[PDB]
Structure formats: C-alpha cells, structure tokens
Amino acid sequence: QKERLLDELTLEGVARYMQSERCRRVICLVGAGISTSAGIPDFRSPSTGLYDNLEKYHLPYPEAIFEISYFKKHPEPFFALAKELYPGQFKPTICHYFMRLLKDKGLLLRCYTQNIDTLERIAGLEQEDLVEAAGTFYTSHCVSASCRHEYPLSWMKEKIFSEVTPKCEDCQSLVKPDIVFFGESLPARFFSCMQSDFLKVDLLLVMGTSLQVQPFASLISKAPLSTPRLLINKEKAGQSGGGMDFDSKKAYRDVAWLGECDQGCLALAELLGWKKELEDLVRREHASIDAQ
Amino acid sequence: APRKQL
Ligand SMILES: NC(=O)c1ccc[n+]([C@@H]2O[C@H](COP(=O)([O-])OP(=O)(O)OC[C@H]3O[C@@H](n4cnc5c(N)ncnc54)[C@H](O)[C@@H]3O)[C@@H](O)[C@H]2O)c1
Ligand SMILES: *C(=O)CCCCCCCCCCCCC
Ligand SMILES: [Zn+2]
C-alpha cells in the first residue's frame, strides 16, 4: 500500500515525522557532494569538478582514469592523480557528523557511501554502520589472484608521493587501492545488506550524489513505497520503487532541499533542536583530530 | 556480482 506518512512535503514535515514514534530506522545514501566542503572535488561540478580537470593526464577521455581495464593497461595517470589529490588532512564535514549523531541517537540503520575518503569511519561510524559501495583507499591489494598481498595506506602513500608505481614486493603484480573501479564488481556486503536493510527502513536520506552511478542509484527504488525520501543536494537528482517524484500531482513522499549538504543538515538539526549538540560534536571531534 | 558503471 502506497501510504502517506509525511504530513507535508517539506523539511519541517520530515522533521515532525522524524519526531514520530514510527521513525526508528534511517538509511543514508551519500556521494561526493558531502565531502566537497572537506576540499575533495566531486566529478560532475563545473570548472571545479574532476571531469573538467583531467585533460592534462592525456587520457582517451576523462572517465578512463577510473576504468578498471584502462587502469590495468596503464595505472600511471591514476597514481599521479592520487598524488595531486591526496589531502593534507582527513577532517569530516558537518554532514558527516550529522550521521554520527543519528548513530548516537539510535536512528542509524546504515550509511551506504560511494565515497572512498574514509571520512565516515573517521567521523565515528563503525564498520557495521557502513556499506562502502565503491570500496576504500585505506587498504590496497596486489592484483595477482593467487597472492593478494595486502599493503597499508602508508606503503601506498610512500609510493604515490615517490612517483613509483606500486608493485607487490613478492610477486611483482601491480598494487591497486581497494577501490571499485568502473567495470568492477561491487562488494558482497552491498547486495546482502540491501536485502536485509530496506525491509526495516522508515526514512531514506540522500545527500550529495547525482545518482548516475549504478547499481547504487537504484537503491532508492528498493525502499518500501511508503518510505519517505529526503534529498539534500545542490541540484535535484533521482528523477529519470520508482525514481524521485518531487513536484507532480502524484507526489506523496519525496522532498528535495536544494543547497549545501552542510546547510541542510544544520537546518534539520535545528528543527529537531539538535543544532547545539551537532555544533559541539563537530568542534570536539575536529579538535581531537587537530590534536594528532 | 553486478558491476560499477555510469
Ligand atoms: N570523496 C570521494 O570519495 C569522491 C570524490 C569524487 C568522486 N567520487 C566518485 O564519484 C562518483 C560519482 O557519484 P557522486 O554522485 O558522488 O558524484 P557526482 O560528481 O556525480 O555528483 C555529486 C553531486 O553532489 C552535488 N554537490 C556537490 N557539492 C555539494 C555540496 N557541497 N553540497 C551539496 N551537494 C553538493 C553535485 O551537484 C552533484 O549532484 C562516485 O562513484 C564516487 O565514488 C568520490
Ligand atoms: C567510483 O566512482 C570509482 C572511482 C573513484 C574515484 C576516486 C576519486 C578520489 C580522489 C581523491 C584521491 C584519493 C585519496 C583518498
Ligand atoms: Zn603479490
């Protein structure tokens, strides 16, 4: 049954609903827009986006650098790019901490993330809270099936800053971050968690993704038809379970809030009377990081 | 396992 649980298709609606006794189980879906404030570029933004900033790596086209088969025949563009992009400091955003607070308030069933920056773990989400849908830069493995030597971040970082292409110390096979390059299979966990999680979901909260990457994007339509969906994004996504209907005669459960993910989270914090708690969480945790 | 693609 396509029931209605939002009183109004606004963020105040979503907040009241969040305050209802029914809303106990939240899933976050996130992408690259939630980390743009931490100085990590997204792909799709103009001038700043990565797809407008690769020309100087002499690729067949921009996308190729993140393609498993191109990376295999020529891994050098990628690792030179990794050195250009490698952050001076890994400091999660407000958006990140807004999900930490959900976890703390008992409301977070799962965060499904497309990012590889590890900011979620850093912000305090345990492994069990997370499905890293495009993998992680944190660990790396050699590509030989029969070897699969793990290597640490530091080893991988050494190599990157050295401009030495990582080779397994044992078998000499190329060493790849545990990222899921385009053309790769998504991790086992993704499909298994998606089977369990979407049958308990009271609210979908979608932030800083253009929802063009599959099969992450389709997660939206795995939600029960009655489950309200909030997007917090600069631009509307999810349109082309069913895609996001925000604005037509039939709209009943979807909201778009258009602006910065940081701004959105603070606004929702505010409606819940969370603003101070969230402000204090960011500060305490930011300083703990600066303390190292 | 289905596959990362644009
Ligand atoms: N941090 C990272 O791990 C990172 C960075 C860049 C790209 N990627 C990869 O890019 C792929 C594309 O997916 P995507 O949708 O995440 O990226 P995308 O570039 O396709 O879309 C990002 C979306 O975020 C929006 N946005 C950007 N900055 C924002 C902000 N500050 N506040 C609110 N919205 C903001 C953009 O308008 C866009 O709709 C993913 O597979 C991901 O692995 C990851
Ligand atoms: C999914 O879209 C696979 C491609 C992943 C894009 C990687 C972008 C990350 C750039 C930051 C440099 C790495 C430092 C952790
Ligand atoms: Zn090896």
PDB file of C-alpha atoms in Angstrom, chain A residues 6-7 11-24 26 107 203 268-274:
ATOM      1  CA  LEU A   6       4.703  12.815   5.729  1.00  0.00           C
ATOM      2  CA  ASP A   7       2.138  15.417   6.735  1.00  0.00           C
ATOM      3  CA  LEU A  11      11.756  19.530   5.654  1.00  0.00           C
ATOM      4  CA  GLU A  12       9.564  20.543   8.604  1.00  0.00           C
ATOM      5  CA  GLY A  13       7.337  17.647   7.526  1.00  0.00           C
ATOM      6  CA  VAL A  14      10.312  15.269   7.574  1.00  0.00           C
ATOM      7  CA  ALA A  15      11.363  16.637  10.986  1.00  0.00           C
ATOM      8  CA  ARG A  16       7.956  16.135  12.668  1.00  0.00           C
ATOM      9  CA  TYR A  17       7.883  12.665  11.110  1.00  0.00           C
ATOM     10  CA  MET A  18      11.411  12.061  12.456  1.00  0.00           C
ATOM     11  CA  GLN A  19       9.982  13.018  15.874  1.00  0.00           C
ATOM     12  CA  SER A  20       7.114  10.484  15.444  1.00  0.00           C
ATOM     13  CA  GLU A  21       7.450   7.170  17.291  1.00  0.00           C
ATOM     14  CA  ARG A  22       7.248   5.316  13.970  1.00  0.00           C
ATOM     15  CA  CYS A  23      10.578   6.700  12.602  1.00  0.00           C
ATOM     16  CA  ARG A  24      13.218   4.445  14.160  1.00  0.00           C
ATOM     17  CA  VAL A  26      17.172   5.558   8.889  1.00  0.00           C
ATOM     18  CA  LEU A 107      18.401   6.179  14.448  1.00  0.00           C
ATOM     19  CA  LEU A 203      13.302   7.094   6.176  1.00  0.00           C
ATOM     20  CA  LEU A 268      17.282  19.693  10.061  1.00  0.00           C
ATOM     21  CA  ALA A 269      19.324  19.580  13.275  1.00  0.00           C
ATOM     22  CA  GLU A 270      17.621  22.879  14.091  1.00  0.00           C
ATOM     23  CA  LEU A 271      14.062  21.620  13.568  1.00  0.00           C
ATOM     24  CA  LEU A 272      14.872  18.693  15.907  1.00  0.00           C
ATOM     25  CA  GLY A 273      16.502  21.050  18.424  1.00  0.00           C
ATOM     26  CA  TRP A 274      19.833  19.349  17.710  1.00  0.00           C
TER      27      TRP A 274
END
